Design a protein around this ligand. Structure first.
Ligand SMILES: NC(=O)c1ccc[n+]([C@@H]2O[C@H](COP(=O)([O-])OP(=O)(O)OC[C@H]3O[C@@H](n4cnc5c(N)ncnc54)[C@H](OP(=O)(O)O)[C@@H]3O)[C@@H](O)[C@H]2O)c1
Ligand SMILES: C[C@]1(O)CC(=O)c2c(cc(O)c3c2C(=O)c2cccc(O)c2C3=O)C1
Lengths: 245, 252, 253, 252
């Protein structure tokens, strides 16, 4: 039971971190959750187990994002697992969460690394959305997990932030596009998300603590439900006040 | 009831977004102080409505924008809370009350300006300042702003100015109350059907609907439900922010 | 230069700091400038003298802002001064620069001080714009000096930030309002700026203010003045309703 | 002229905004590298116009968004720079080159996507990376973004994604390059008449004109004159920002 009973959801990159927590949370609201990961079937199944242990419903879906054919593989697996469990291909909630980072100075960024950041973080989300319009009913949900680094300068992750900048444009423009179909499209921006180095990252928030994976997941689940029907095209700041300069 | 055994004050609460906000917060198990400037009866009609759902609420009278406004309000509030809970703890503060100008820029007088500032910006500042002594660590402050802070409309410039002032309150009090774990956030409504004579008129309603990407006017419920979320535990990691409850009016 | 030759301007709070430098840069570009100040007639005459030494044109205007009759006196003096030197009351450029800070913790703010900050920082600029519309021609300019404190949290000056967030709303709605008359309306947001005070004589404090800028220096009054001058000229005809970040990258974090 | 003694590269300066930017920078006395993909005559026409007005410019030819683009661009750039100044100093970099998608969201192919990224966001990044050694302390990077980063338009979502990436390039390199005194800023045009067929129909024009509060479309000089200000000394204290050169298109 819960807000999302009889709803289906897909969360990309949800074997670890925010994705995992988001899947758990959405499942807790009574949603059927496709747990996606790129490479680890094991981690993906740990998540599916937890959801079942806590009385919810989920299934793992493996498909490496960032490579030719990623969208085919994601949906082939996804659409089957859905018809298997509901006899429909409907996808009520899409969470674009998967993302990889750069971790080098701009002078060390290769054309190839740039291509891959774009491919996983921005290109996949675009073509995942495009194909998912097929499955998403009227009144459905799209939620894109952004990054605090889009509002906060960090040259050590410039290529990463560029791709998340790109992802945030999905929110603005698909919100407009999907208006007539009553599908809301929003972004969620985390802060820093989980020694003496702990003490310094905790300083960035006004709450003097580091973010937890739950801190973001709870905002996603709100966006995923009916209480958020009148919010679209917007950016939700789940960073514990990190943007306040 | 996720807000059970919590207390809430919503200013300008006898009608419109305020009404719906009180009703929603009550429905979540919170005892709600329903504030009004003038009509004791209208504020009691809301209290009535809440109790018929198995909720807890009490009316409060205090004309905002005049000398001693804050005093009268917190006098009645502290009284009503003690009588009902043996404490005067205020978990949730919603600054909802506000008035518009409805004249062109060249037609604004000093008296109107002063009046807009007094009700829309001054009162909320001092209601926050006073409420600090009643809000526990982990409490909630929600300021109802306006989409006109992001969408040009000269016909309400002075009103928007007072609301932009309100949002700055949000920014700075959020930083100030971080160590006490109180979130401070603004909710910006779009065009919302309250009950004014413009909404009696279709074609006018048709015009306003088009501002939203969903092709409808907002309902009071649309905004109250966003307020309710910020009031709850799911929004503990959101502070100092502006939530866009306009149905995508800001998209251009 | 002669870019603003034939133009007139008013810069409020123009005897000191950012206001002063703005008045100076406008005059340099060829504008006849009304230097306003609230009380100090001498400091205003000093700016005028400086502008004249450089071969420009300026006059002083006394009018205390934030008290009853402030707009009235300002424009009485403005109009007399403009008519004498040009034969017209045409006001091409209006710069809303004047403002006062609160300098008090959010708990010590009284209803009086709040009124005072509003009256000076929000009320006056609104009514100055309102009254100035009668003098500003099609093609004219309005620049509002805001604050980086609208973008950067600082509870120490919260009431002041509210008045300045009010001021940004002026920019947004009047830009829309004044579109059909081809007047641009923009905001300029300073960061920390060295206004000549003793505070800036201490290097240890200078350094910790400098760190807020990506360039590792404090701003000069001239860094802000030069942006205002750009907005005020023809090259910025296609910018309106916007906010210019003249703070040396303070908002980057 | 403010830019006497300085050099500038403007990518895609053979027509539209790039062309006018090149022309305006040369007018202030800068030596301008005029760039485009293959059309030598197109680049040279801009060079001709600049020379008539008594300025200095040379054409440089490199198709952006293909393996080797950067190498080919800088080889041509330095050659031409050395032939004229006997130095490879680049004072001013303007990332203007850009292409549009122009198909519905459902129609976008991986191929089109890759192409927009490669030209609009990736090339600017690697051009910057490579230019860093030629740009002296106190120099300038100006990135030509788009109002579509703030104004919803599904017909160009992929394009707008690349411009969102572009604005991130501004934010992060502004920080990275601060200790070197290099300002990095975005200029975001609205609808600007660039000679394409759409600006010929006086009906679609009137419609486009209505996006601005001045009720006209932008001209190429409207944007170029903003770039020129950023390229000069008067804008030394602005960095990491977005300049809204749309004539008030983002006001709602
Ligand atoms: N005009 C508008 O409405 C508008 C609005 C917002 C933003 N913008 C932005 O402003 C910039 C220029 O706009 P515009 O309207 O002036 O464009 P334009 O008239 O189409 O000219 C663009 C220039 O970019 C060059 N270019 C395109 N692809 C290239 C490639 N792969 N390699 C090398 N050069 C390339 C073109 O040269 P070749 O022909 O040789 O390729 C051309 O000189 C773009 O970044 C655009 O996104 C324009
Ligand atoms: C010139 C054009 O063929 C027409 C067009 O559709 C457009 C194009 C490029 C743009 O950057 C924009 C726009 C735009 O409308 C438009 C409409 C409203 C706001 C905008 O920022 C824009 C644009 O930025 C391609």
């Amino acid at each position: 039971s819960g807000k999302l009973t009889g709803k289906t959801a897909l969360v990309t990159g949800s074997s670890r971190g925010i994705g995992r927590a988001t899947a758990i949370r959405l499942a807790r609201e009574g949603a059927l959750v496709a747990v996606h990961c790129s490479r680890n079937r094991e981690a993906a199944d740990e998540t599916v187990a937890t959801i079942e242990k806590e009385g919810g419903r989920a299934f793992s879906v493996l498909a490496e994002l960032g490579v030719p054919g990623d969208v085919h593989e994601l949906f082939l697996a996804l659409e089957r697992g859905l018809k298997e469990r509901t006899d429909a291909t409907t996808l009520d909630i899409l969470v674009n969460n998967a993302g990889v980072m750069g971790g080098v100075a701009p002078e060390e960024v290769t054309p190839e690394l740039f291509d891959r950041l774009v491919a996983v973080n921005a290109k996949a989300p675009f073509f995942i959305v495009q194909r998912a319009l097929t499955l998403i009913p009227d009144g459905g949900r799209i939620i894109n997990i952004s990054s605090g680094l889009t509002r906060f300068a960090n040259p050590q992750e410039v290529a990463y932030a560029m791709t998340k900048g790109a992802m945030d444009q999905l929110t603005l423009h698909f919100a407009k596009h999907l208006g007539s179909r009553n599908i809301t499209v929003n972004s969620v921006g985390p802060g820093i998300t989980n020694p003496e180095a702990v003490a310094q990252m905790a300083g960035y928030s006004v709450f003097n603590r580091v973010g937890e994976v739950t801190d973001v997941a709870d905002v996603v689940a709100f966006l995923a439900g009916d209480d958020a029907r009148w919010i679209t095209g917007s950016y939700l700041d789940a960073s514990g006040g990190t943007l306040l300069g």
